[PDB]
Amino acid sequence: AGDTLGLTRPNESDAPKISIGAKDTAVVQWQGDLLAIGATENDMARDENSKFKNPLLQQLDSELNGLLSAASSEEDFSGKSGQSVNLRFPGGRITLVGLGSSASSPTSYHSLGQAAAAAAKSSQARNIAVALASTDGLSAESKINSASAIATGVVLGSFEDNRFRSESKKSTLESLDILGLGTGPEIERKIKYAEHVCAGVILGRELVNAPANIVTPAVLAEEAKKIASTYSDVISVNILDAEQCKELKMGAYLAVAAAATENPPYFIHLCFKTPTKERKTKLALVGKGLTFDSGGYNLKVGARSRIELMKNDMGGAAAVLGAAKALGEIRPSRVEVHFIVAACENMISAEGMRPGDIVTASNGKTIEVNNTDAEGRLTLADALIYACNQGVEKIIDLATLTGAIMVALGPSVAGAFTPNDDLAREVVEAAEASGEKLWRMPMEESYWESMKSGVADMINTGPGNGGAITGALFLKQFVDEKVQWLHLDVAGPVWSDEKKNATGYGVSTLVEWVLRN
Amino acid sequence: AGDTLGLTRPNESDAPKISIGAKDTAVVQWQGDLLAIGATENDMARDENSKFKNPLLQQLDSELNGLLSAASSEEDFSGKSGQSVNLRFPGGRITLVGLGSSASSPTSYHSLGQAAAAAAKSSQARNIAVALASTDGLSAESKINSASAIATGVVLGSFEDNRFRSESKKSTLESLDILGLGTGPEIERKIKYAEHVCAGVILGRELVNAPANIVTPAVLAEEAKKIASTYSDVISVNILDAEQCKELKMGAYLAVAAAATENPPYFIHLCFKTPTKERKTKLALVGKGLTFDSGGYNLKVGARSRIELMKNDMGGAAAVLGAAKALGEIRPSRVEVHFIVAACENMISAEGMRPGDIVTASNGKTIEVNNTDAEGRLTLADALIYACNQGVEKIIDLATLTGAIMVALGPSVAGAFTPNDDLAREVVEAAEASGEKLWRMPMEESYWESMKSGVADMINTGPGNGGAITGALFLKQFVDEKVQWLHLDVAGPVWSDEKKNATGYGVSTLVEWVLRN
Amino acid sequence: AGDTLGLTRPNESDAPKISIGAKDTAVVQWQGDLLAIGATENDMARDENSKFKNPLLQQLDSELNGLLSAASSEEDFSGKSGQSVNLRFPGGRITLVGLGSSASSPTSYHSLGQAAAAAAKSSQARNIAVALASTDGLSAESKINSASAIATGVVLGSFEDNRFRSESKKSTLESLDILGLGTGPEIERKIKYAEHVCAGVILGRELVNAPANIVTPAVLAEEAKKIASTYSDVISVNILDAEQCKELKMGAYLAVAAAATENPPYFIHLCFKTPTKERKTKLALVGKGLTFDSGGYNLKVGARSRIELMKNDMGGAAAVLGAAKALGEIRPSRVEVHFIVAACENMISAEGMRPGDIVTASNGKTIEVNNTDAEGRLTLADALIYACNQGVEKIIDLATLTGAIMVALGPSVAGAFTPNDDLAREVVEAAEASGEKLWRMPMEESYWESMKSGVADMINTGPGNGGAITGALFLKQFVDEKVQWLHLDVAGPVWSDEKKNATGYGVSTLVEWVLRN
Ligand SMILES: [Cl-]
Ligand SMILES: [Cl-]
Ligand SMILES: [Cl-]
Ligand SMILES: [Cl-]
Ligand SMILES: [Cl-]
Ligand SMILES: [Cl-]
Ligand SMILES: [Cl-]
Ligand SMILES: [Cl-]
Ligand SMILES: [Cl-]
Ligand SMILES: [Mg+2]
Ligand SMILES: [Mg+2]
Ligand SMILES: [Mg+2]
Ligand SMILES: [Mg+2]
Ligand SMILES: [Mg+2]
Ligand SMILES: [Mg+2]
Numbered sequence A, B, C: 001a002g003d004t005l006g007l008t009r010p011n012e013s014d015a016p017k018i019s020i021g022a023k024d025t026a027v028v029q030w031q032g033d034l035l036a037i038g039a040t041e042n043d044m045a046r047d048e049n050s051k052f053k054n055p056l057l058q059q060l061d062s063e064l065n066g067l068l069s070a071a072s073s074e075e076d077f078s079g080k081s082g083q084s085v086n087l088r089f090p091g092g093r094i095t096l097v098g099l100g101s102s103a104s105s106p107t108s109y110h111s112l113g114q115a116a117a118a119a120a121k122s123s124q125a126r127n128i129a130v131a132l133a134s135t136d137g138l139s140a141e142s143k144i145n146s147a148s149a150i151a152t153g154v155v156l157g158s159f160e161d162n163r164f165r166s167e168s169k170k171s172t173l174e175s176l177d178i179l180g181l182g183t184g185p186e187i188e189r190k191i192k193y194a195e196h197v198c199a200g201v202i203l204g205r206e207l208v209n210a211p212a213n214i215v216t217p218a219v220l221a222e223e224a225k226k227i228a229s230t231y232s233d234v235i236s237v238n239i240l241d242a243e244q245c246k247e248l249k250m251g252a253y254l255a256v257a258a259a260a261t262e263n264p265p266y267f268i269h270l271c272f273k274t275p276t277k278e279r280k281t282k283l284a285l286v287g288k289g290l291t292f293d294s295g296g297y298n299l300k301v302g303a304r305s306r307i308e309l310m311k312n313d314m315g316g317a318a319a320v321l322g323a324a325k326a327l328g329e330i331r332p333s334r335v336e337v338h339f340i341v342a343a344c345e346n347m348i349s350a351e352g353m354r355p356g357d358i359v360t361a362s363n364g365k366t367i368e369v370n371n372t373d374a375e376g377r378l379t380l381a382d383a384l385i386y387a388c389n390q391g392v393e394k395i396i397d398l399a400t401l402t403g404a405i406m407v408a409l410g411p412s413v414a415g416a417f418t419p420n421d422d423l424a425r426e427v428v429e430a431a432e433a434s435g436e437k438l439w440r441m442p443m444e445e446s447y448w449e450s451m452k453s454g455v456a457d458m459i460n461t462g463p464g465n466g467g468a469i470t471g472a473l474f475l476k477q478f479v480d481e482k483v484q485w486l487h488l489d490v491a492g493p494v495w496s497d498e499k500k501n502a503t504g505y506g507v508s509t510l511v512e513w514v515l516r517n
Helices: A055-063 A067-074 A107-122 A140-158 A185-209 A217-230 A242-247 A251-257 A307-330 A376-389 A403-409 A421-434 A445-451 A467-476 A507-516 B055-063 B067-074 B107-122 B140-158 B185-209 B217-230 B242-247 B251-257 B307-330 B376-389 B403-409 B421-434 B445-451 B467-476 B507-516 C055-063 C067-074 C107-122 C140-158 C185-209 C217-230 C242-247 C251-257 C307-330 C376-389 C403-409 C421-434 C445-451 C467-476 C507-516
Strands: A019-023 A034-040 A084-089 A092-100 A127-132 A175-179 A235-240 A266-272 A281-293 A335-346 A358-360 A366-368 A394-399 A414-417 A438-440 A484-489 B019-023 B034-040 B084-089 B092-100 B127-132 B175-179 B235-240 B266-272 B281-293 B335-346 B358-360 B366-368 B394-399 B414-417 B438-440 B484-489 C019-023 C034-040 C084-089 C092-100 C127-132 C175-179 C235-240 C266-272 C281-293 C335-346 C358-360 C366-368 C394-399 C414-417 C438-440 C484-489
Touching (some): A019 A140, A019 A185, A034 A055, A055 A067, A067 A084, A067 A092, A067 C084, A084 C067, A107 A127, A107 A140, A127 A140, A140 A175, A140 A185, A185 A217, A185 A307, A185 A507, A217 A266, A217 A281, A217 A335, A235 A307, A242 A251, A251 A358, A251 A376, A281 A307, A281 A376, A281 A507, A307 A335, A307 A394, A307 A507, A335 A376, A376 A394, A376 A467, A394 A421, A394 A507, A403 A467, A403 B403, A403 B467, A414 A421, A414 A467, A421 A438, A421 A484, A421 A507, A445 A467, B019 B140, B019 B185, B034 B055, B034 B107, B055 B067, B067 B084, B084 B107, B107 B127, B107 B140, B127 B140, B140 B175, B140 B185, B185 B217, B185 B307, B185 B507, B217 B266, B217 B281, B242 B251, B251 B358, B251 B376, B266 B307, B266 B376, B281 B307, B307 B394, B307 B507, B335 B376, B376 B394, B376 B467, B394 B421, B394 B507, B403 B467, B414 B421, B421 B438, B421 B484, B421 B507, B445 B467, B467 B484, C019 C185, C034 C107, C055 C067, C067 C084, C067 C092, C084 C107, C092 C107, C107 C127, C140 C185, C185 C217, C185 C307, C217 C266, C217 C281, C217 C307, C217 C335, C242 C251, C251 C335, C251 C358, C251 C376, C266 C307, C266 C376, C281 C307, C281 C376, C281 C507, C307 C335, C307 C394, C307 C507, C335 C376, C376 C394, C376 C467, C394 C421, C394 C507, C403 C414, C403 C467, C414 C421, C421 C507, C445 C467, C467 C484
Parallel strands (some): A019 A175, A034 A127, A127 A175, A281 A335, A281 A394, A394 A484, A414 A438, B019 B175, B034 B092, B034 B127, B127 B175, B281 B335, B414 B438, C019 C175, C034 C127, C281 C335, C414 C438
Antiparallel strands (some): A266 A335, A358 A366, B235 B266, B266 B335, B358 B366, B414 B484, C084 C092, C235 C266, C414 C484
16 A cells, blocks of 8 residues: 555454354253353362263263363362353363452453353364353343453454564454343343444554554544444544644644644544534544644653553544444433544654643643653643533543553553542543553643743653653643543553553443433 | 660650640630630621621731731731741730631641641740630531640641750640630540540651661561550550561561661560450551661661651551551550551661572462562561461551652552452541542552563562552452452652651541541 | 571472383373373374364374364364474373474474473373374484473473462372384483483472572582481582681672671582592582572662562572582583582671772782672672682583573573683583583673773673673682683573573583583
8 A cells, every 4th residue: 555654554343243142042942062061179179979060061061971070170170250161062162261269350251252252263163152150149130241241351362463464364263153142132232332332442453563664644534524424323524634723823732743844733622422403512523633642742661661562542432433333323311412533743953842842722821841752741632622612521531641550550451540539439440441551640730830841831751750640630720620530540550561462441431321311 | 775776766755735624714804825716717707997806806806906907917927828927925825727618627727727726836835725716607517626636736736856956945835725616525535535645646657757776676666565565454565576477487578678687677566455345346457667768788878768768658557556656545446456566677788688588478379579669568577467367357567668659649648458349438538537648549459560581480670660559459468358458659748858757647637547447 | 497587387298200111102092191192293194075184183183083174173273383283182192282394403302392291281180191293204212211201391391389388289190101112221221311401400490499488598508518427429519607717718609698697608619420430520510599689788779670589599509419410310421520519698788888888809819899789799709719629620600690691592592601602502402412402602802901990900880881891801810720611501491481480500511511511
């Protein structure tokens, strides 16, 4: 492809194509290529004869003349978290997946689904089923929630992104039956819901996986246009170029973008709402959209600069867009959702911002840019101002903002910062439902003193100690106090080092939060 | 002093000696060297004539023929946080201290007291008074709490540690009258209580300020002996030497101590309880007591190693001892409090632990010491085991454990880690009452995977990302699960960079927590 | 254990205890817990019907009614290197292990054995068998060599060192039958030989795994004494203390050892020979025996200093001792083998060598120690002189000498340096037979110019560029030119980062080299 740096052309998308149903079929009767059973440590208990006490495992073992309990014992499988046994026999394949002794909802069922997907891929299975060894004392509603979390683990666990690999094998998984957790309209509705969330998660992973010569600011804006065109009855789009953002006086955003003359910036505005008449709560989801971040003149240097992973500095924007993709299918009433991303890349050239430059955001405040590698908060300053100007009641921003948050919270837990206690409670509860990991961090106001400039209204970059907190405090200067606002620093969990791949972190939590408004 | 490295002899202690009373005297009638008035922004409102509307300021200004409102206006004092006006006139001196627009209890009143102390010191005042410009709509109980917080700010703000300075001036402040907040037994009882807490805070600051050639492990154990001897009806002491700790199989502690052959280690055990018969809840306060930390063979190197401040690595122990000093005066019933510090210094010699050495804690678990600069958690392993073995129901440990927590939370906010939600609530509430800043951080269990060893039961040092969390998870391996336990990483707030001095952080929170049991 | 730093006591040794035989039993007839089959890509070819063409796999699949070829296809096993299929069925367990398309002897058969051991451990197997899918066109001698290499992979792959873990599971593997490769005296003799080499490899791994608070110079000398006592008819021992090494004028060795006053140095001399009368070629094996290396005053600092792995700086000594252990069982005629290790630890204290100190080796040459972290070559200087003084014809030294060699050759390939072309050929051929990876590097003489001192005969540490080569050139100053000598820099392969464990690298190559003299 001749306009792309390095002539790289992506292959066709690998988004999963799986037909999912909830069935009542007795597990012993089910037919297909693979049955995955989620078993807790208690589920694995054995009697005086070393036989399974769990009625389902007892029955399956009995059909296999003891082969299942023999193999489990030899392999020391006792239902612990992370354990699995895989048995191929005449007629099919069974895998037991350990759930541990404190099975948490929905993450345990996500992991059951992921394990079922990994075992499907390693035997090239096409049609699989998943059941729990026990559903005793789970309510009808808990079983429905466990069903849709299993479906999520299977769909997302099946996804392998092979767009940039010259040779690879397509996924073979075609269907999933979820057994023993309920049938009929309500469970099917909840599974459908999970599938819509998964399509947004997968779009998120694809946008972040793709390198920055493929996903440029223009391409990110085209991706937002494609979402609006797909759901054009409920989502509209406005893309602003650099000239329009200049008329809107977005000096902090345009200053970050100034160096990157080859891949011009675009400011993305999507708006979801159903065309009905009821009152709508107005919400904004703002995502940091640095399609690449070199650091600018404050170039990222050192052996763990991670400069080579900075295509993932649009990870917040990928979550906002994935949330739009999910909500276009789900079509909730009662909400109007603005999805806003100031997309650009942070490069080095003769046109670029210098360290020490003073830039003026669209609310008139001046910022001394003492480090050009703290550029995401400058693009967010203008995005947050624009979001407030659309008349929204509540805003969540997601940004890969600081290394400091990963020091604080490790790679897997995002830090949530907000002046507004009710909004914190809403987001914590949304994350409890989605299974995603986040943690409220304090907006310690006394650290604002370190952000003073000798020349402008403020600097952009505080000391390393407390760096995620002064990031949050900086963003607060650009948010109208009448709007509830929470900032989620997702530098860690947007990317998995162990998988070397994007996670699509944030999409499911944002969708839950919208639906709970 | 001939046995001290560098021949250094401390001067006499500068602990404040202030007589404090609560009085009803009309502020305009009060006589002495300095009156400090706490004023909020609202308290500073002026009428059509530019005169104060607040009845107290109106009256004082009227006696000064307008000099007070003239000076306030010229100096642009309007009651904002951090502002003050100082006026000397025939008959006395007044200072107005800004309290801002959201005066929080008790920190605002701490700051009022601190400001009154700073203004006393700069005019060599001996007898001062503090009042609020307004007490409207404060309950009798809130006024008592504001009185004792003012007394705290004055006492602690007056303290200047001049033990190691060859020439310096003694503090001149002799008395404080707190006006308009109530009189009689209940307010006097609460002020007395604050004074007891202050004596513990000040002992804490002195222990941490003193350099490591003065406060050695032996000297720290002598300081604990002096507390027990002072309060010998309610506090007993047992000091264990290296040989006794070896009989108790404290291999992780003794390994850290092994290099420091010149200043041998001592394990400090104090126990507070009143000699009465009621049931006592059994609690332990465990403090990290590294009287110096070079890093050992993993020497602290680099321009911000802070090696030159590592006398403050016994900051957790200083809080535990200060809490003992306070509780010996307060004598609460219903509690038995164990104060435990495994004191040592972490040095380099031929006898020292090498990186990669495997050490065995007293519960039998083996630790591969992949970094000898993560030595505090090894001494704490054995201290926590000992605390559990005394039969306590709840434990709090305080330790200057990680640089990672200061990255997360800045210099002023400690991170609290606990498996036990009720204990977290107790400590959060204790800190709300004490005014100290702390914040719960999560014990993310998935990070325990990074702590695996190829040879021992675990390593001592995880990756930088999530380092405060894996510190917490490591300590958890040494705590009996039946005991509620919370770990407070106080690396930041035990030391003030701006003041170049110790804070005695932790003492007041621990005392509140004990009294709320 | 009260004299050990950290009170650590090793558990009982986990050296494998496996009974190994070579059998003619048809593979389909064999009975036990696990059969492992080594299959090349060609061995996996299928016919028009998708059935195995290989007669053995065809037969096994036919007994399993197609279950083996079904499972292989689903799992995409086609005999590639690193692939395996594991099938549990009524009556037993089979694993197919991919050997690839260019199966090299003996490493391929090592890997087959290792894979069989890993599959034994994961099903707790006690009695296993290994066969090749095809032995067509392998000579009787190649099949014997493949048998003993399989036995090696099984024995070494089974070994798990749990001496320092407080809870762990003992290995269950008890017996190995090697099928279809021959029976009778010659194959049994070759398997026995491999077992003797394995016992030396395992002693090597144990000595290196053990941390430096457990394996001190004294303990290493006791380990050498135990070897001599075990084989006292053919191996004698002389251990020299610091005072005796001083009489021998070993100033470079004693200078390195000077700081470590707590763990004194011992110079280990073993001598193997059978008590018969024929002429013996006299050989020496010299191993660098730094039981720990801090760097000394040139302390190892930086995030990848690897200071925490420096217990493995006695990896060369571990190979020399393991070779002694093997040769004590093998008892070759015609050779007299001196095994020499100048054991010490490189610490920091008031007694230690300073950078810039001039030390005098026992041949009278003076060395300016411009970096105390290049200390291994100073201990080797005196060890090499002593080896020459015993009248040997050829010397090999093994040392973990330089980071530079790992830069050059990666973690898995040792660099061999020698003035003597015939000795290089001997060692290359010995390594071809043992399967170990090494590569001749040049002794570029022009770089000796960088080793000049302004004050002594030479410095010890050249520039980083060419650092492994100037290491070799330095050692050459201490070797009599009449003695053939080769230096093997094994800094990389003595330790596996992926396994977090010692490899015992060097033992099998040294044993082959001795037997080929
Ligand atoms: Cl079948
Ligand atoms: Cl694309
Ligand atoms: Cl509004
Ligand atoms: Cl006067
Ligand atoms: Cl003192
Ligand atoms: Cl208890
Ligand atoms: Cl069987
Ligand atoms: Cl040993
Ligand atoms: Cl000779
Ligand atoms: Mg940046
Ligand atoms: Mg960025
Ligand atoms: Mg330390
Ligand atoms: Mg420390
Ligand atoms: Mg060295
Ligand atoms: Mg060395």
